Amino acid sequence: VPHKSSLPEGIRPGTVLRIRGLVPPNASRFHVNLLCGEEQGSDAALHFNPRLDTSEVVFNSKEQGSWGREERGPGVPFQRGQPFEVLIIASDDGFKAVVGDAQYHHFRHRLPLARVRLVEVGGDVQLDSVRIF
Amino acid sequence: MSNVPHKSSLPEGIRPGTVLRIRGLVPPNASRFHVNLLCGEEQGSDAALHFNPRLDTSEVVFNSKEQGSWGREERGPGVPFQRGQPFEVLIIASDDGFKAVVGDAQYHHFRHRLPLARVRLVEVGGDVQLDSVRIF
């Protein structure tokens, strides 16, 4: 079952999302989604998708039911059997993804930051905590 | 010789979305310590933010300094620092001010008095053992 953090006021430049958890021993992939509503199939301002089985981290957006063009970060800073800490930092121009205290990828906004209403974490991850500062 | 404040430069300044992470330890007999967001490298430069945990009065004072004059102090609730204990502080810049997070809890919101665009260095001084300043 996915974890959901409701943000009915939305988020602004200066919003910090900290996601901690464990990648379990046989994990295929997991995701952190910044969604614009609570309906299934809602728009995704950010889809952050570490894929352990393919050794890729995919970034994408979803807009009226259709996915955009994927972006990929450099390699995969996640491992089966290892805990992680991800920061997703909203600024005026995009999201900064920090993994293991290292700046990892910058994802330019494709949807207005103001439309975000929900953070959802799902897939093969054993969640420690999601915090929004 | 000891107690020289630690400085970290901000070569391109800071913006909404800048995250300052300050990790340290409060010495067993600390009086007070501070984190300053300063607008220049000279003594007496303006402080966009002065974050001043005071253990001997059990309070946390927030303020700004402009033209060598301190502004109106604000205080957070109580004091989430303890002598002899490690701490982690987040200072997060937004459009409307700085959010101070202490011990993983939102602690105070200090609305901007000086422009974020003028902040050019982080200074940590007082009775504190500084482990790391990281800028995200």
Author numbering:
A (entry chain A): 4 to 136
B (entry chain B): 1 to 136
Quote the authors verbatim:
Galectins (Gals) are a family of animal lectins that bind β-galactose-containing glycoconjugates, and their carbohydrate recognition domain (CRD) has a conservative amino acid sequence. To date, 16 mammalian galectins have been discovered, and galectin-7 (Gal-7; also termed p53-induced gene 1 product), belonging to prototype galectins, is a multifunctional effector by productive pairing with distinct glycoconjugates and protein counter-receptors in the cytoplasm and nucleus, as well as on the cell surface. Gal-7 participates in diverse processes, such as controlling apoptosis, cell migration and cell adhesion. Gal-7 was crystallized in complex with glycerol under two different conditions.
The two refined structures, structure 1 (homodimeric Gal-7 binds two glycerol molecules) and structure 2 (homodimeric Gal-7 binds three glycerol molecules), were crystallized using two different conditions, one at a relatively low concentration of PEG3350 (12%) and the other at a higher concentration (20%). Homodimeric Gal-7 binds three glycerol molecules at its two carbohydrate recognition binding sites (GOL A and GOL B) and the new binding pocket formed by its N-terminal and loop connecting strands S2 and F1 (GOL C), respectively. Monomer A of structure 2 can bind two glycerols. Its N-terminal (Asn 3-Val 4) and loop connecting strands S2 and F1(Val 124-Leu 130) form a GOL C-binding pocket. GOL C can form hydrogen bonds with Val 4 and Gly 126, respectively. In addition, GOL C interacts indirectly with Val 128 and Leu 130 through a water molecule in the new ligand binding pocket of Gal-7. This means that the N-terminal of Gal-7 interacts with loop connecting strands S2 and F1 via a hydrogen bond bridge formed between GOL C and a molecule of water. Discrepancies between structure 1 and structure 2 in monomer A are due to the absence or presence of GOL C. B-factors of structure 1 suggests that the N-terminal regions are very flexible, while the N-terminal region of structure 2 is relatively stable due to the binding of GOL C. Glycerol binds the pocket near the N-terminus of Gal-7, which can greatly reduce the flexibility and improve the stability of this region. It is noted that glycerol binds to GOL C sites of monomer A but not monomer B in structure 2. In addition, we found the GOL C pocket, which binds glycerol in structure 2 of Gal-7, is deep and negatively charged with surrounding amino acids.
